[PDB]
Design an enzyme around this catalytic site. Structure first.
Site, short mmCIF file in Angstrom:
data_model
loop_
_atom_site.label_atom_id
_atom_site.label_comp_id
_atom_site.label_asym_id
_atom_site.label_seq_id
_atom_site.Cartn_x
_atom_site.Cartn_y
_atom_site.Cartn_z
N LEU A 136 0.83 -1.19 0.00
CA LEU A 136 0.00 0.00 0.00
C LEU A 136 0.87 1.25 0.00
O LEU A 136 2.10 1.18 -0.10
CB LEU A 136 -0.95 -0.03 1.20
CG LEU A 136 -1.99 -1.14 1.11
CD1 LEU A 136 -3.01 -1.01 2.23
CD2 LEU A 136 -2.66 -1.09 -0.25
N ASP A 137 0.23 2.41 0.11
CA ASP A 137 0.93 3.68 0.14
C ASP A 137 0.28 4.57 1.19
O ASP A 137 -0.56 4.12 1.99
CB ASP A 137 0.94 4.33 -1.24
CG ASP A 137 -0.45 4.55 -1.78
OD1 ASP A 137 -1.36 3.81 -1.36
OD2 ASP A 137 -0.63 5.46 -2.62
N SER A 138 0.67 5.84 1.19
CA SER A 138 0.27 6.76 2.25
C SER A 138 -1.22 7.04 2.23
O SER A 138 -1.85 7.17 3.29
CB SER A 138 1.07 8.05 2.14
OG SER A 138 1.09 8.50 0.80
#
Ligand SMILES: CCCCCCCCCCCCCCCCCC(=O)OC[C@H](COP(=O)([O-])OCC(O)COP(=O)([O-])OC[C@@H](COC(=O)CCCCCCCCCCCCCCCCC)OC(=O)CCCCCCCCCCCCCCCCC)OC(=O)CCCCCCCCCCCCCCCCC
Ligand SMILES: CCCCCCCCCCCCCCCCCC(=O)OC[C@H](COP(=O)([O-])OCC[N+](C)(C)C)OC(=O)CCCCCCCCCCCCCCCCC
Ligand SMILES: CCCCCCCCCCCCCCCCCC(=O)OC[C@H](COP(=O)(O)OCCN)OC(=O)CCCCCCCCCCCCCCCCC
Ligand SMILES: CCCCCCCCCCCCCC(=O)SCCNC(=O)CCNC(=O)[C@@H](O)C(C)(C)COP(=O)(O)O
Ligand code: SF4
Ligand code: SF4
Lengths: 112, 178, 114, 115, 99, 79, 207
Positions: F37-39
């Site tokens: 995932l990411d931020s």
């Protein structure tokens, strides 16, 4: 003796000689904290001293207004207290210092 | 100089007769009755309304109406394809494509004026050096479609042929001022 | 080299402001869809918000990121009010226009455009 | 019976007029047409939120003064009485205390539309 | 203008002012729509002599603004001044002070 | 501090995220490394935690939060 | 000469003296002082001194410029700081006008002077909306003249005259939708520049 100032929101402000006196003396006293080489200090001392001299010279309100040429005496009082506020703000600032940064060479060149 | 609009000079004191007058003004609604009388007088005046389609409003020979392309008395078109009317047109409403004619005269092939883009300012008719384009007195030319207001050279020449009996008289009455 | 910041000293607090703005948009999307009678769902609007952040998500200059945050806050403010209408909030989706294809064959078949 | 017939005839006339108004013309209904007006923009609120009227004390005073009106209204039959002195005194007292209540409210700034 | 005497009296009394003297419909006192042709005068500089354009070329009298101080060009007891003398107070009108 | 309740409600949110976890999660599973995932996905998870627990997580600790284990222990030491 | 304006060297000298006065009162910020041949005084300052310069000119006793006439920006996209922010100030006491100039780029905001003049609220909103110059400490700084979803700052020199999008009613979606702009006329630019110079007084030295 004056009934109204003619400007909305400007109070009649009886005994204006004492009020102008204390405003001008406060302006001088706060100008004493500026540097001696401050051009703002020199010019504002000139203005405040000559206005205090004419407010001590003239006891009548109408003739004092004619001498001051700053509109009504209540306008003169408002301008004096705004000059005092400017003196405080210019003590907080230091505008007598040299230029903060030179602009680029073509910044004020017109036409391009 | 200056003057006051609501300031009063001194006071009229308090008097029984003046107090009674003010009391009667308040209670009897005297200024309201006065306004009633004013609009009653306007009722009994004569109205300024004209019967519109039979009595038209007055105008002037300088009036800017519908555009037209004029001709010389010989019948030759006045326009010489010089395009400075579209150069001065502040709305860019004119398109003046042109070429030499069969007899070699400098004439236009496309002269379009977008009446939906035109601002009716007369700059073309005051810029034209041969009085070719004019703004004649026609203003009752409202259409039911947007396309009918996109004039071409045939439409403008038809308007010039239609309104020449009036445009020439207006230019005769007006040309010494311009 | 040696520029004046506007809000953020470096990229980290700029990303912090970005995250705060994204949280605010993510929370505001359901209220917008409920208040303005939008045809879309809540998932579509949040995906559109993510799409806008992603299409702005390639810049590494702190001043530019701060200005994008400021403009996003202005857009969020006029979406918090109903200053933007249904038309204004559906202009983000481009439901009418056909996208120009990304392939050379299609861009050659129609138009002289690169 | 006569007044009943006239009332029913007027009601039937109004119903006939609105039925003609609803079944005569041509209908073309869509969402943007039937949306609430709000001067050419979508309404921010639902027009059912609290309104916060500013003359609530005047409204309650109106209730009390309306019942004082109900007290004062049998005077045309009251003046036919055989005593007329207690009647006159009672009417004077009623009007005087109503006026005293109005004067007290005016002094206490009750009818001044507190914002 | 074409009103009876009784109606004129009623209008004047109801308005409080005389209306036939200054009625707002124009009848005949306006100018004729057909006017004699004009002969507009020529202005100055139609002199045919002593009329060179360089002696009346106001457009080329414009100079670049004068630099008072500069942070580049200059590289830098007396009384305090004002941008102009203070504006004299207006006099009250004499035909109608209305004060 | 109802540790099992905090843990299985956090896992309930993660399962009902509908983007990740095709039987890939663990308690100590990292979002950026393991879940990929990411931020923005991480702050969506944080907002889901706020919406499920009724208290607000600021950005200063959410950015150092990395796994569901620190979610459950952060909620425990906050409550 | 009936076709040329009078000069008024007296008011030119007065404005020059007041320019010296302000330039020596505020040497920290004043970068240039000039008086035009049209008798207008311009004071070009550093952007850091906008608040002190405007406060001094608002309430100094000899410089009462309490009325702010105009606040605008000029996009000159060939200098490093491409926006010139111009304040036109009016002195009712001394019946004078002054002009104060500062500079900005796309990423360098200027402190707002709403605390000095309240008209600067809407004027700085207009400057931000039309040029993208941000203003620090502005209450509710937002767009004021563009459309609600408008992108870009249209008074910039690089923005097109017709814009990038146009609106039309679409019956399928029953909305007013935005499309890329397609003109049926294509506004014809005219090269109305004479190849001969008109004013030798402004002839720039060669590069
Ligand atoms: C009425 C419309 C139909 C007739 C129109 C017509 O032929 O007008 C020509 C003509 C008016 O044209 P005009 O010459 O331009 O007007 C003369 C003045 O400019 C009119 O200006 P004026 O206001 O001075 O004249 C009005 C004049 C005459 O006014 C009347 O007679 C109106 C009725 C007064 C009662 O009033 C009086 O004489 C005093 C009346 C005081 C009343 C208080 O004559 C009339 O209108 C005569 C009066 C007709 C009154 C008809 C009353 C009954 C109407 C039908 C009822 C059912
Ligand atoms: C003041 C007191 C009395 C008030 C009421 C008025 C009384 C007098 C009325 C006289 C006219 C009666 C018919 C009015 C019809 C108005 C609507 C209309 O023209 O609809 C067209 C439509 C036409 O229908 P259509 O078949 O074209 O389809 C409509 C849908 N479009 C057009 C989109 C395809 O309806 C009629 O023609 C109905 C006629 C009814 C006549 C009754 C008598
Ligand atoms: C028994 C009593 C009842 C008898 C029947 C009459 C009913 C009258 C009911 C209302 C009386 C209220 C009087 C007190 C009051 O509220 O006065 C308010 C009024 C000022 O209020 P307002 O006019 O709103 O002014 C706004 C700001 N200037 O105040 C004023 O305007 C001052 C008025 C002073 C004079 C009052 C009248 C004296 C009359 C003497 C007559 C003698 C013969
Ligand atoms: C109804 C729908 C309406 C939609 C309205 C959308 C509003 C859009 C507001 C735009 C605001 C922004 O996009 S500012 C964000 C841009 N920020 C940046 O580019 C900063 C750097 N960005 C990054 O590094 C990006 O990779 C990330 C993913 C944002 C940061 O994550 P890291 O972890 O890797
Ligand atoms: S009247 Fe003006 S706008 Fe219209 S075609 Fe002529 S020049 Fe153009
Ligand atoms: S109408 Fe007149 S101005 Fe226009 S192109 Fe023809 S000659 Fe020239």
């Amino acid at each position: 003796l004056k009934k109204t100032t003619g400007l909305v929101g400007l109070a009649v402000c009886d005994t204006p000689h004492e009020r102008l006196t204390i405003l001008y003396t406060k302006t001088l006293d706060i100008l004493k904290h500026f540097p001696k080489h401050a051009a703002y200090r020199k010019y504002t001392e000139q203005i405040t001293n000559e206005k205090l001299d004419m407010v001590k010279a003239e006891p009548d309100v109408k003739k004092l207004e004619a001498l001051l040429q700053g509109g009504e005496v209540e306008e003169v009082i408002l301008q004096a207290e705004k000059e005092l506020s400017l003196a405080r703000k210019m003590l907080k600032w230091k505008p007598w210092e040299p230029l903060v940064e030179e602009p680029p060479a073509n910044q004020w060149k017109w036409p391009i | 100089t200056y003057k006051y609009v609501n300031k009063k000079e001194q006071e009229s004191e308090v008097d029984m007769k003046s107090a009674t007058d003010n009391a009667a003004r308040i209670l009897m609604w005297t200024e309201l009755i006065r306004g009633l009388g004013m609009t009653l007088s306007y009722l009994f005046r004569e109205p300024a309304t004209i019967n519109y389609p039979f009595e038209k409003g007055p105008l002037s020979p300088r009036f800017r109406g519908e555009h037209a392309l004029r001709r010389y008395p010989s019948g030759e078109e006045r326009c010489i394809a010089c395009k400075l009317c579209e150069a001065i047109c502040p709305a860019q409403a004119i398109t003046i494509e042109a070429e030499p004619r069969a007899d070699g005269s400098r004439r236009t092939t496309r002269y379009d004026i977008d009446m939906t883009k035109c601002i009716y300012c007369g700059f073309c008719q005051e810029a034209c050096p041969v009085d070719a384009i004019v703004e004649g007195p026609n203003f009752e030319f409202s259409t039911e479609t947007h396309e009918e207001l996109l004039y071409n050279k045939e439409k403008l020449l038809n308007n010039g042929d239609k309104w020449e009996a009036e445009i020439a008289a207006n230019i005769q009455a007006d040309y010494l001022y311009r | 080299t040696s520029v004046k910041p506007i809000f953020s000293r470096d990229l980290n607090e700029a990303k912090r402001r970005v995250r705060e703005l994204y949280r605010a948009w993510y929370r505001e999307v359901p209220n917008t869809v409920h208040l303005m009678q939008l045809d879309i769902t809540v998932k579509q609007g949040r995906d559109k918000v993510r799409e806008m952040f992603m299409k702005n998500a390639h810049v590494t200059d702190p001043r530019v990121v701060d200005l994008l945050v400021i403009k996003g806050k202005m857009e969020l403010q006029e979406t918090i009010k109903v200053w933007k209408q249904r038309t204004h909030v559906m202009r983000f989706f481009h439901e009418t226009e056909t996208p120009r294809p990304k392939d050379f064959l299609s861009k050659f078949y129609m138009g002289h455009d690169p | 019976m006569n007044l009943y017939t006239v009332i029913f005839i007027n009601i039937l006339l109004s119903l006939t007029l609105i039925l003609v108004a609803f079944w005569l013309p041509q209908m073309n209904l869509y969402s943007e047409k039937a949306n609430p007006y709000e001067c050419g923009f979508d309404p921010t609120s639902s027009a059912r939120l609290p309104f916060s009227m500013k003359f609530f004390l005047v409204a309650i005073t109106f209730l009390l003064f309306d019942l004082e009106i109900a007290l004062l209204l049998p005077l045309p039959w009251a003046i036919q009485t055989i005593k007329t002195s207690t009647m006159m005194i009672m009417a004077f007292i009623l009007v005087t205390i109503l006026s005293l209540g109005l004067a007290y409210e005016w002094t206490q700034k009750g009818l001044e539309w507190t914002e | 203008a074409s009103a009876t005497r009784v109606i004129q009296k009623l209008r004047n009394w109801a308005s409080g002012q005389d209306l036939q003297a200054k009625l707002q419909l124009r009848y005949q006192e306006i100018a004729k729509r057909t006017q004699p042709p004009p002969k507009l005068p020529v202005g100055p500089s139609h002199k045919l002599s002593n009329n060179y354009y360089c002696t009346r070329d106001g457009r080329r009298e414009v100079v670049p603004p004068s630099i008072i101080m500069s942070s580049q060009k200059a590289l830098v007891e007396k009384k305090a001044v004002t941008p102009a003398p203070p504006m004299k107070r207006w006099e009250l009108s004499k035909d109608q002070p209305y004060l | 501090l109802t540790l099992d309740g905090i843990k299985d409600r956090v896992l309930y949110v993660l399962k009902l995220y509908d983007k990740i976890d095709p039987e890939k999660l663990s308690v100590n599973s990292h979002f950026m490394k393991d879940l990929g995932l990411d931020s923005l996905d991480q702050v969506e998870i944080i907002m889901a935690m706020e919406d499920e627990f009724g208290f607000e997580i600021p950005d200063i600790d959410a950015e150092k939060l990395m796994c569901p284990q620190e979610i459950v222990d952060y909620i425990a030491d906050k409550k | 000469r009936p076709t040329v304006r009078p000069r008024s060297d007296v008011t030119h000298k007065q404005l020059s003296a007041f320019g010296e006065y302000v330039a020596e009162i505020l040497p920290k910020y004043v970068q240039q002082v000039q008086v035009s041949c049209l008798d207008e005084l311009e004071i070009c300052i550093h952007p850091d001194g906008v608040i002190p310069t405007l406060t001094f000119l608002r309430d100094h006793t000899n410089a009462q410029f309490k009325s702010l006439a105009d606040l605008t920006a000029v996009d000159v996209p060939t200098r490093q700081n491409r926006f010139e922010i111009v304040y036109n100030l009016l002195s009712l006491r001394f019946n004078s006008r002054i002009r104060v100039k500062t500079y900005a780029d796309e990423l360098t905001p200027i402190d707002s002077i709403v605390s000095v003049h309240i008209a600067a609220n809407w004027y700085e909103r207009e400057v931000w909306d039309m040029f993208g110059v941000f203003f620090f400490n502005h209450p509710d700084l937002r767009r004021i003249l563009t459309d609600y979803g408008f992108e870009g700052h249209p008074f910039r020199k690089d923005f097109p005259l017709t814009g990038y999008v146009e609106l039309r009613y679409d019956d399928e979606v029953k909305r007013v939708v935005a499309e890329p702009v397609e003109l049926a006329q294509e506004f014809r630019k005219f090269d109305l520049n004479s190849p001969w110079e008109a004013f030798p007084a402004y002839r720039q030295p060669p590069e």
